PDB file of all heavy atoms in Angstrom:
ATOM      1  N   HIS A   1     -99.539 -32.208-323.363  1.00  0.00           N
ATOM      2  CA  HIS A   1     -98.190 -32.333-323.662  1.00  0.00           C
ATOM      3  C   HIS A   1     -97.559 -31.087-324.295  1.00  0.00           C
ATOM      4  O   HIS A   1     -98.210 -30.439-325.151  1.00  0.00           O
ATOM      5  CB  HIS A   1     -97.918 -33.539-324.540  1.00  0.00           C
ATOM      6  CG  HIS A   1     -98.433 -34.866-324.217  1.00  0.00           C
ATOM      7  ND1 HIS A   1     -99.274 -35.497-325.097  1.00  0.00           N
ATOM      8  CD2 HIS A   1     -98.619 -35.629-323.066  1.00  0.00           C
ATOM      9  CE1 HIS A   1     -99.796 -36.637-324.627  1.00  0.00           C
ATOM     10  NE2 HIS A   1     -99.341 -36.672-323.332  1.00  0.00           N
ATOM     11  N   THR A   3     -94.456 -30.922-326.061  1.00  0.00           N
ATOM     12  CA  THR A   3     -94.054 -30.973-327.502  1.00  0.00           C
ATOM     13  C   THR A   3     -95.345 -31.286-328.349  1.00  0.00           C
ATOM     14  O   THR A   3     -96.045 -32.302-327.874  1.00  0.00           O
ATOM     15  CB  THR A   3     -92.998 -32.007-327.699  1.00  0.00           C
ATOM     16  OG1 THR A   3     -91.771 -31.526-327.052  1.00  0.00           O
ATOM     17  CG2 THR A   3     -92.547 -32.221-329.188  1.00  0.00           C
ATOM     18  N   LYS A   4     -95.606 -30.451-329.400  1.00  0.00           N
ATOM     19  CA  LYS A   4     -96.730 -30.725-330.308  1.00  0.00           C
ATOM     20  C   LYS A   4     -96.194 -31.660-331.387  1.00  0.00           C
ATOM     21  O   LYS A   4     -95.191 -31.496-331.999  1.00  0.00           O
ATOM     22  CB  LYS A   4     -97.344 -29.393-330.637  1.00  0.00           C
ATOM     23  N   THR A   6     -97.788 -32.573-335.033  1.00  0.00           N
ATOM     24  CA  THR A   6     -98.720 -31.994-335.885  1.00  0.00           C
ATOM     25  C   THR A   6     -98.601 -32.749-337.289  1.00  0.00           C
ATOM     26  O   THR A   6     -97.412 -33.005-337.647  1.00  0.00           O
ATOM     27  CB  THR A   6     -98.699 -30.405-335.924  1.00  0.00           C
ATOM     28  OG1 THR A   6     -99.836 -29.975-336.714  1.00  0.00           O
ATOM     29  CG2 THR A   6     -97.444 -29.976-336.650  1.00  0.00           C
ATOM     30  N   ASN A   7     -99.723 -32.834-337.963  1.00  0.00           N
ATOM     31  CA  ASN A   7     -99.767 -33.607-339.337  1.00  0.00           C
ATOM     32  C   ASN A   7     -99.379 -32.627-340.363  1.00  0.00           C
ATOM     33  O   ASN A   7     -99.120 -33.097-341.508  1.00  0.00           O
ATOM     34  CB  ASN A   7    -101.058 -34.220-339.474  1.00  0.00           C
ATOM     35  CG  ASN A   7    -101.319 -35.520-338.445  1.00  0.00           C
ATOM     36  OD1 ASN A   7    -102.481 -35.768-338.216  1.00  0.00           O
ATOM     37  ND2 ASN A   7    -100.145 -36.058-337.959  1.00  0.00           N
ATOM     38  N   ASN A  15     -98.128 -19.286-335.625  1.00  0.00           N
ATOM     39  CA  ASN A  15     -98.548 -19.993-334.342  1.00  0.00           C
ATOM     40  C   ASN A  15     -97.266 -20.079-333.420  1.00  0.00           C
ATOM     41  O   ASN A  15     -97.253 -20.947-332.565  1.00  0.00           O
ATOM     42  CB  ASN A  15     -99.296 -21.284-334.648  1.00  0.00           C
ATOM     43  CG  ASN A  15    -100.708 -21.008-335.146  1.00  0.00           C
ATOM     44  OD1 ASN A  15    -101.395 -19.960-334.911  1.00  0.00           O
ATOM     45  ND2 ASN A  15    -101.241 -22.067-335.803  1.00  0.00           N
ATOM     46  N   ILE A  18     -96.563 -17.500-327.301  1.00  0.00           N
ATOM     47  CA  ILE A  18     -96.745 -16.413-326.431  1.00  0.00           C
ATOM     48  C   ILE A  18     -96.253 -16.590-325.142  1.00  0.00           C
ATOM     49  O   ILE A  18     -96.689 -17.443-324.325  1.00  0.00           O
ATOM     50  CB  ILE A  18     -98.237 -15.769-326.577  1.00  0.00           C
ATOM     51  CG1 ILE A  18     -98.550 -15.685-328.066  1.00  0.00           C
ATOM     52  CG2 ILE A  18     -98.496 -14.628-325.763  1.00  0.00           C
ATOM     53  CD1 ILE A  18     -99.996 -14.935-328.413  1.00  0.00           C
ATOM     54  N   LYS A  20     -94.591 -15.269-321.173  1.00  0.00           N
ATOM     55  CA  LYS A  20     -94.603 -14.334-320.240  1.00  0.00           C
ATOM     56  C   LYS A  20     -93.088 -13.816-319.973  1.00  0.00           C
ATOM     57  O   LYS A  20     -92.240 -14.790-319.855  1.00  0.00           O
ATOM     58  CB  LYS A  20     -95.179 -15.007-319.022  1.00  0.00           C
ATOM     59  CG  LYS A  20     -95.384 -14.105-317.706  1.00  0.00           C
ATOM     60  CD  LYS A  20     -96.213 -14.633-316.659  1.00  0.00           C
ATOM     61  CE  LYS A  20     -95.906 -13.439-315.606  1.00  0.00           C
ATOM     62  NZ  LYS A  20     -96.541 -14.052-314.375  1.00  0.00           N
ATOM     63  N   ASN A  22     -90.542 -12.594-317.060  1.00  0.00           N
ATOM     64  CA  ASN A  22     -90.621 -12.849-315.611  1.00  0.00           C
ATOM     65  C   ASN A  22     -89.691 -12.239-314.818  1.00  0.00           C
ATOM     66  O   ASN A  22     -89.789 -12.237-313.528  1.00  0.00           O
ATOM     67  CB  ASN A  22     -90.377 -14.348-315.306  1.00  0.00           C
ATOM     68  CG  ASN A  22     -91.599 -15.205-315.710  1.00  0.00           C
ATOM     69  OD1 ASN A  22     -92.631 -14.994-315.080  1.00  0.00           O
ATOM     70  ND2 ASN A  22     -91.396 -16.064-316.682  1.00  0.00           N
ATOM     71  N   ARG A  23     -88.742 -11.322-315.394  1.00  0.00           N
ATOM     72  CA  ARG A  23     -87.665 -10.651-314.674  1.00  0.00           C
ATOM     73  C   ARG A  23     -87.619  -9.208-314.987  1.00  0.00           C
ATOM     74  O   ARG A  23     -87.524  -8.486-314.124  1.00  0.00           O
ATOM     75  CB  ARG A  23     -86.250 -11.486-314.903  1.00  0.00           C
ATOM     76  CG  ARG A  23     -86.182 -12.690-314.045  1.00  0.00           C
ATOM     77  CD  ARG A  23     -84.834 -13.479-313.998  1.00  0.00           C
ATOM     78  NE  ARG A  23     -84.951 -14.874-313.763  1.00  0.00           N
ATOM     79  CZ  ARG A  23     -84.823 -15.935-314.616  1.00  0.00           C
ATOM     80  NH1 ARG A  23     -84.319 -15.829-315.885  1.00  0.00           N
ATOM     81  NH2 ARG A  23     -85.146 -17.220-314.323  1.00  0.00           N
ATOM     82  N   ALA A  86     -95.337 -22.735-350.334  1.00  0.00           N
ATOM     83  CA  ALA A  86     -94.794 -23.992-350.427  1.00  0.00           C
ATOM     84  C   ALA A  86     -95.590 -24.982-349.573  1.00  0.00           C
ATOM     85  O   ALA A  86     -95.938 -26.152-350.034  1.00  0.00           O
ATOM     86  CB  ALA A  86     -93.404 -24.084-350.121  1.00  0.00           C
ATOM     87  N   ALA A  87     -95.763 -24.469-348.264  1.00  0.00           N
ATOM     88  CA  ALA A  87     -96.708 -25.322-347.355  1.00  0.00           C
ATOM     89  C   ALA A  87     -97.943 -25.688-347.960  1.00  0.00           C
ATOM     90  O   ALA A  87     -98.312 -26.872-347.828  1.00  0.00           O
ATOM     91  CB  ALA A  87     -96.793 -24.580-346.028  1.00  0.00           C
ATOM     92  N   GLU A 161    -106.479 -17.342-333.646  1.00  0.00           N
ATOM     93  CA  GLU A 161    -105.649 -18.508-333.698  1.00  0.00           C
ATOM     94  C   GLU A 161    -104.270 -18.137-333.347  1.00  0.00           C
ATOM     95  O   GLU A 161    -103.501 -18.822-332.475  1.00  0.00           O
ATOM     96  CB  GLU A 161    -106.010 -19.356-334.908  1.00  0.00           C
ATOM     97  CG  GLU A 161    -105.187 -20.587-334.814  1.00  0.00           C
ATOM     98  CD  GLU A 161    -105.268 -21.463-336.098  1.00  0.00           C
ATOM     99  OE1 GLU A 161    -106.130 -21.310-336.899  1.00  0.00           O
ATOM    100  OE2 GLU A 161    -104.310 -22.332-336.294  1.00  0.00           O
ATOM    101  N   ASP A 165    -106.237 -17.688-328.847  1.00  0.00           N
ATOM    102  CA  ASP A 165    -107.478 -17.205-328.198  1.00  0.00           C
ATOM    103  C   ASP A 165    -107.262 -16.426-326.909  1.00  0.00           C
ATOM    104  O   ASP A 165    -108.235 -16.199-326.241  1.00  0.00           O
ATOM    105  CB  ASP A 165    -108.480 -18.253-328.023  1.00  0.00           C
ATOM    106  CG  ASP A 165    -109.124 -18.736-329.305  1.00  0.00           C
ATOM    107  OD1 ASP A 165    -109.697 -17.884-330.033  1.00  0.00           O
ATOM    108  OD2 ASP A 165    -108.890 -19.926-329.646  1.00  0.00           O
ATOM    109  N   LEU A 274     -75.652  -8.625-335.175  1.00  0.00           N
ATOM    110  CA  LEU A 274     -74.297  -9.076-334.845  1.00  0.00           C
ATOM    111  C   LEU A 274     -73.244  -8.028-334.869  1.00  0.00           C
ATOM    112  O   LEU A 274     -72.280  -7.916-334.182  1.00  0.00           O
ATOM    113  CB  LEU A 274     -73.791 -10.441-335.444  1.00  0.00           C
ATOM    114  CG  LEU A 274     -74.334 -11.770-334.860  1.00  0.00           C
ATOM    115  CD1 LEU A 274     -73.941 -12.974-335.549  1.00  0.00           C
ATOM    116  CD2 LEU A 274     -74.244 -11.919-333.322  1.00  0.00           C
TER     117      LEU A 274
ATOM    118  N   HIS B   2    -105.346 -25.943-328.790  1.00  0.00           N
ATOM    119  CA  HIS B   2    -104.911 -24.736-329.411  1.00  0.00           C
ATOM    120  C   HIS B   2    -103.420 -24.700-329.882  1.00  0.00           C
ATOM    121  O   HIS B   2    -102.464 -25.199-329.241  1.00  0.00           O
ATOM    122  CB  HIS B   2    -105.002 -23.358-328.682  1.00  0.00           C
ATOM    123  CG  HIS B   2    -106.354 -22.967-328.377  1.00  0.00           C
ATOM    124  ND1 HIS B   2    -106.989 -22.986-327.115  1.00  0.00           N
ATOM    125  CD2 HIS B   2    -107.330 -22.501-329.202  1.00  0.00           C
ATOM    126  CE1 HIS B   2    -108.252 -22.687-327.167  1.00  0.00           C
ATOM    127  NE2 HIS B   2    -108.510 -22.326-328.463  1.00  0.00           N
ATOM    128  N   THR B   4    -101.431 -22.079-331.010  1.00  0.00           N
ATOM    129  CA  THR B   4    -100.573 -21.152-330.376  1.00  0.00           C
ATOM    130  C   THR B   4    -100.592 -21.562-328.862  1.00  0.00           C
ATOM    131  O   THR B   4    -101.561 -21.412-328.380  1.00  0.00           O
ATOM    132  CB  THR B   4    -100.856 -19.670-330.664  1.00  0.00           C
ATOM    133  OG1 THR B   4    -100.968 -19.580-332.025  1.00  0.00           O
ATOM    134  CG2 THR B   4     -99.921 -18.679-329.918  1.00  0.00           C
ATOM    135  N   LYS B   5     -99.393 -21.769-328.327  1.00  0.00           N
ATOM    136  CA  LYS B   5     -99.153 -21.945-326.874  1.00  0.00           C
ATOM    137  C   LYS B   5     -99.064 -20.601-326.230  1.00  0.00           C
ATOM    138  O   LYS B   5     -98.233 -19.847-326.625  1.00  0.00           O
ATOM    139  CB  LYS B   5     -97.830 -22.935-326.737  1.00  0.00           C
ATOM    140  N   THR B   7     -97.672 -19.481-322.531  1.00  0.00           N
ATOM    141  CA  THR B   7     -96.769 -20.110-321.529  1.00  0.00           C
ATOM    142  C   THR B   7     -96.339 -19.100-320.562  1.00  0.00           C
ATOM    143  O   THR B   7     -96.022 -17.961-320.979  1.00  0.00           O
ATOM    144  CB  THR B   7     -95.796 -21.073-322.247  1.00  0.00           C
ATOM    145  OG1 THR B   7     -95.110 -21.755-321.176  1.00  0.00           O
ATOM    146  CG2 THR B   7     -94.635 -20.406-322.970  1.00  0.00           C
ATOM    147  N   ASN B   8     -96.208 -19.495-319.303  1.00  0.00           N
ATOM    148  CA  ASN B   8     -95.742 -18.635-318.044  1.00  0.00           C
ATOM    149  C   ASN B   8     -94.297 -18.504-318.077  1.00  0.00           C
ATOM    150  O   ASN B   8     -93.633 -17.645-317.378  1.00  0.00           O
ATOM    151  CB  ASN B   8     -96.213 -19.354-316.800  1.00  0.00           C
ATOM    152  CG  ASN B   8     -95.626 -20.704-316.541  1.00  0.00           C
ATOM    153  OD1 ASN B   8     -94.531 -20.899-315.928  1.00  0.00           O
ATOM    154  ND2 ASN B   8     -96.328 -21.731-316.995  1.00  0.00           N
ATOM    155  N   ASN B  16     -88.754 -28.501-326.713  1.00  0.00           N
ATOM    156  CA  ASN B  16     -90.198 -28.706-326.997  1.00  0.00           C
ATOM    157  C   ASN B  16     -90.634 -28.177-328.432  1.00  0.00           C
ATOM    158  O   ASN B  16     -91.775 -28.005-328.615  1.00  0.00           O
ATOM    159  CB  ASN B  16     -91.016 -28.241-325.788  1.00  0.00           C
ATOM    160  CG  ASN B  16     -90.951 -29.190-324.691  1.00  0.00           C
ATOM    161  OD1 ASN B  16     -90.532 -30.436-324.839  1.00  0.00           O
ATOM    162  ND2 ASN B  16     -91.229 -28.663-323.507  1.00  0.00           N
ATOM    163  N   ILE B  19     -93.046 -31.541-333.730  1.00  0.00           N
ATOM    164  CA  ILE B  19     -92.773 -32.748-334.499  1.00  0.00           C
ATOM    165  C   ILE B  19     -93.832 -32.794-335.583  1.00  0.00           C
ATOM    166  O   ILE B  19     -95.046 -32.875-335.393  1.00  0.00           O
ATOM    167  CB  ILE B  19     -92.813 -34.000-333.565  1.00  0.00           C
ATOM    168  CG1 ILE B  19     -91.734 -33.934-332.464  1.00  0.00           C
ATOM    169  CG2 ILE B  19     -92.785 -35.348-334.341  1.00  0.00           C
ATOM    170  CD1 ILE B  19     -91.687 -35.119-331.438  1.00  0.00           C
ATOM    171  N   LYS B  21     -95.210 -33.912-339.487  1.00  0.00           N
ATOM    172  CA  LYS B  21     -95.260 -35.063-340.506  1.00  0.00           C
ATOM    173  C   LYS B  21     -94.893 -34.357-341.868  1.00  0.00           C
ATOM    174  O   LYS B  21     -95.129 -33.248-342.132  1.00  0.00           O
ATOM    175  CB  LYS B  21     -96.802 -35.363-340.584  1.00  0.00           C
ATOM    176  CG  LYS B  21     -96.997 -36.597-341.457  1.00  0.00           C
ATOM    177  CD  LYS B  21     -98.445 -37.259-341.503  1.00  0.00           C
ATOM    178  CE  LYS B  21     -98.569 -38.004-342.738  1.00  0.00           C
ATOM    179  NZ  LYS B  21     -99.807 -38.599-342.726  1.00  0.00           N
ATOM    180  N   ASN B  23     -95.406 -34.628-345.839  1.00  0.00           N
ATOM    181  CA  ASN B  23     -96.667 -34.810-346.466  1.00  0.00           C
ATOM    182  C   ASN B  23     -96.390 -35.105-348.014  1.00  0.00           C
ATOM    183  O   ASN B  23     -97.279 -35.512-348.763  1.00  0.00           O
ATOM    184  CB  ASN B  23     -97.656 -33.725-346.231  1.00  0.00           C
ATOM    185  CG  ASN B  23     -98.327 -33.913-344.850  1.00  0.00           C
ATOM    186  OD1 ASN B  23     -98.851 -34.943-344.588  1.00  0.00           O
ATOM    187  ND2 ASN B  23     -98.257 -32.725-344.126  1.00  0.00           N
ATOM    188  N   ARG B  24     -95.140 -34.841-348.587  1.00  0.00           N
ATOM    189  CA  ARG B  24     -94.998 -34.782-349.970  1.00  0.00           C
ATOM    190  C   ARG B  24     -93.765 -35.733-350.390  1.00  0.00           C
ATOM    191  O   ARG B  24     -93.857 -36.254-351.453  1.00  0.00           O
ATOM    192  CB  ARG B  24     -94.987 -33.335-350.680  1.00  0.00           C
ATOM    193  CG  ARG B  24     -96.232 -32.620-350.465  1.00  0.00           C
ATOM    194  CD  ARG B  24     -96.558 -31.317-351.517  1.00  0.00           C
ATOM    195  NE  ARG B  24     -97.630 -30.502-351.088  1.00  0.00           N
ATOM    196  CZ  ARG B  24     -97.764 -29.547-350.212  1.00  0.00           C
ATOM    197  NH1 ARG B  24     -96.625 -28.926-349.702  1.00  0.00           N
ATOM    198  NH2 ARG B  24     -99.001 -29.081-349.894  1.00  0.00           N
ATOM    199  N   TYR B  34     -92.019 -38.160-339.479  1.00  0.00           N
ATOM    200  CA  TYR B  34     -92.034 -36.923-338.737  1.00  0.00           C
ATOM    201  C   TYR B  34     -90.739 -36.348-338.358  1.00  0.00           C
ATOM    202  O   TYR B  34     -89.774 -37.200-338.098  1.00  0.00           O
ATOM    203  CB  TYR B  34     -93.004 -37.218-337.612  1.00  0.00           C
ATOM    204  CG  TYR B  34     -94.472 -37.529-337.616  1.00  0.00           C
ATOM    205  CD1 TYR B  34     -94.968 -38.740-338.152  1.00  0.00           C
ATOM    206  CD2 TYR B  34     -95.422 -36.525-337.205  1.00  0.00           C
ATOM    207  CE1 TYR B  34     -96.247 -38.979-338.308  1.00  0.00           C
ATOM    208  CE2 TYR B  34     -96.794 -36.853-337.397  1.00  0.00           C
ATOM    209  CZ  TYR B  34     -97.146 -37.994-337.866  1.00  0.00           C
ATOM    210  OH  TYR B  34     -98.486 -38.434-337.973  1.00  0.00           O
ATOM    211  N   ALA B  87     -79.723 -18.859-318.928  1.00  0.00           N
ATOM    212  CA  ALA B  87     -80.218 -17.565-318.777  1.00  0.00           C
ATOM    213  C   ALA B  87     -81.691 -17.635-318.384  1.00  0.00           C
ATOM    214  O   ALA B  87     -82.259 -16.907-317.568  1.00  0.00           O
ATOM    215  CB  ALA B  87     -80.024 -16.661-319.936  1.00  0.00           C
ATOM    216  N   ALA B  88     -82.401 -18.577-319.161  1.00  0.00           N
ATOM    217  CA  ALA B  88     -83.735 -18.983-318.804  1.00  0.00           C
ATOM    218  C   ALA B  88     -83.885 -19.255-317.370  1.00  0.00           C
ATOM    219  O   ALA B  88     -84.720 -18.749-316.673  1.00  0.00           O
ATOM    220  CB  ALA B  88     -84.191 -20.076-319.734  1.00  0.00           C
ATOM    221  N   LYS B 107     -70.809 -14.271-329.697  1.00  0.00           N
ATOM    222  CA  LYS B 107     -71.590 -13.077-329.390  1.00  0.00           C
ATOM    223  C   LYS B 107     -73.072 -13.504-329.037  1.00  0.00           C
ATOM    224  O   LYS B 107     -73.533 -13.014-328.199  1.00  0.00           O
ATOM    225  CB  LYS B 107     -71.523 -12.085-330.580  1.00  0.00           C
ATOM    226  CG  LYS B 107     -70.218 -11.211-330.598  1.00  0.00           C
ATOM    227  CD  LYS B 107     -70.063 -10.731-331.983  1.00  0.00           C
ATOM    228  CE  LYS B 107     -69.611  -9.369-332.060  1.00  0.00           C
ATOM    229  NZ  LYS B 107     -69.958  -8.960-333.576  1.00  0.00           N
ATOM    230  N   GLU B 158     -90.729 -36.352-322.891  1.00  0.00           N
ATOM    231  CA  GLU B 158     -91.419 -35.023-323.180  1.00  0.00           C
ATOM    232  C   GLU B 158     -91.013 -34.355-324.393  1.00  0.00           C
ATOM    233  O   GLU B 158     -91.822 -33.743-325.152  1.00  0.00           O
ATOM    234  CB  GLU B 158     -91.279 -34.298-321.792  1.00  0.00           C
ATOM    235  CG  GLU B 158     -91.830 -32.774-321.968  1.00  0.00           C
ATOM    236  CD  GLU B 158     -91.618 -31.833-320.836  1.00  0.00           C
ATOM    237  OE1 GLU B 158     -91.096 -31.974-319.689  1.00  0.00           O
ATOM    238  OE2 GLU B 158     -92.164 -30.667-321.181  1.00  0.00           O
TER     239      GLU B 158
END
Side-chain angles (χ1 to χ4, degrees), chain A residues 1 3 6-7 15 18 20 22-23 86-87 161 165 274, chain B residues 2 4 7-8 16 19 21 23-24 34 87-88 107 158:
Chain A
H1 310 125
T3 298
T6 189
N7 295 153
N15 288 334
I18 303 183
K20 189 169 167 189
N22 285 297
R23 285 192 209 102
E161 180 186 344
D165 287 299
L274 283 177
Chain B
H2 295 111
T4 308
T7 187
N8 62 92
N16 286 339
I19 301 175
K21 192 172 157 177
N23 287 300
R24 298 205 191 81
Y34 289 73
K107 288 159 134 195
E158 174 184 2

